[model samples]
Target: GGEAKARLCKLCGQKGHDERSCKGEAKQKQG
Candidate 1:
Protein backbone atom coordinates (compact mmCIF):
# COMPACT_ATOMS: atom_id res chain seq x y z
CA GLY A 1 0.00 0.00 0.00
CA GLY A 2 1.21 3.49 -0.83
CA GLU A 3 0.45 6.17 1.75
CA ALA A 4 -0.15 9.02 -0.61
CA LYS A 5 -0.55 12.50 0.86
CA ALA A 6 -3.97 13.59 -0.36
CA ARG A 7 -6.22 15.66 1.92
CA LEU A 8 -3.36 16.39 4.23
CA CYS A 9 -2.63 20.16 4.33
CA LYS A 10 0.37 20.64 2.09
CA LEU A 11 1.03 23.93 3.85
CA CYS A 12 2.30 22.03 6.85
CA GLY A 13 0.31 18.88 7.30
CA GLN A 14 1.63 16.78 4.40
CA LYS A 15 -0.58 16.93 1.29
CA GLY A 16 -3.62 18.86 0.07
CA HIS A 17 -3.07 20.69 -3.16
CA ASP A 18 0.68 21.24 -3.42
CA GLU A 19 3.10 23.66 -1.75
CA ARG A 20 2.41 26.29 -4.38
CA SER A 21 -1.25 27.18 -3.68
CA CYS A 22 -0.46 27.19 -0.01
CA LYS A 23 -0.80 30.89 0.86
CA GLY A 24 -1.37 30.55 4.60
CA GLU A 25 0.94 28.66 6.94
CA ALA A 26 2.79 27.39 3.91
CA LYS A 27 4.31 30.82 3.37
CA GLN A 28 5.32 30.99 6.99
CA LYS A 29 6.68 27.49 6.89
CA GLN A 30 8.87 28.51 3.98
CA GLY A 31 10.67 31.13 6.01
Candidate 2:
Protein backbone atom coordinates (compact mmCIF):
# COMPACT_ATOMS: atom_id res chain seq x y z
CA GLY A 1 0.00 0.00 0.00
CA GLY A 2 2.39 2.66 1.28
CA GLU A 3 5.35 1.22 -0.61
CA ALA A 4 3.70 2.12 -3.89
CA LYS A 5 2.97 5.64 -2.71
CA ALA A 6 6.56 6.30 -1.68
CA ARG A 7 7.79 5.47 -5.15
CA LEU A 8 5.38 8.00 -6.63
CA CYS A 9 6.13 10.73 -4.12
CA LYS A 10 7.87 13.78 -5.55
CA LEU A 11 8.88 15.09 -2.13
CA CYS A 12 10.74 13.45 0.72
CA GLY A 13 10.17 10.12 -1.05
CA GLN A 14 8.13 8.75 1.79
CA LYS A 15 5.66 5.83 2.08
CA GLY A 16 2.46 7.83 2.22
CA HIS A 17 0.46 9.63 -0.43
CA ASP A 18 1.70 10.60 -3.91
CA GLU A 19 3.41 13.51 -5.66
CA ARG A 20 2.62 16.98 -4.29
CA SER A 21 1.04 15.08 -1.38
CA CYS A 22 3.72 15.25 1.30
CA LYS A 23 3.35 13.51 4.63
CA GLY A 24 6.06 14.97 6.90
CA GLU A 25 9.11 17.23 6.27
CA ALA A 26 10.75 18.09 2.97
CA LYS A 27 14.50 17.64 3.11
CA GLN A 28 15.13 15.80 -0.16
CA LYS A 29 16.68 17.83 -2.96
CA GLN A 30 15.93 17.09 -6.62
CA GLY A 31 18.91 16.70 -8.91
Top candidate when judged by TM-score against the true structure: 2
TM-score for each of the candidates = 0.23, 0.26
Please provide, for model 1 over 1-31, each residue's C-alpha lDDT reduced to its tens digit, 9 standing for 90 to 100.
4577556556667744655656664244453
Candidate 1 Cα errors over 4 Å, as ranges: 1-10, 24-31
Q: What is the Cα-based TM-score of model 1? A: 0.23
* Predicted structure 2, TM vs. truth: 0.26
Question: Model 2 misses residue 21 by how many Å?
Answer: 3.7
Q: Lowest summed lDDT over 10 consecutive residues: which window, candidate 2?
A: 1-10
Candidate 2: where is the Cα deviation over 4 Å? Answer: 1-8, 20-31
Clashes by residue pair, model 1: 8-15
lDDT of 2 by residue, 1-31 (tens): 3334245466656555566556556599999
Global Cα RMSD, each model: 7.3, 7.7
Q: How many residue pairs clash in each candidate?
A: 1, 0
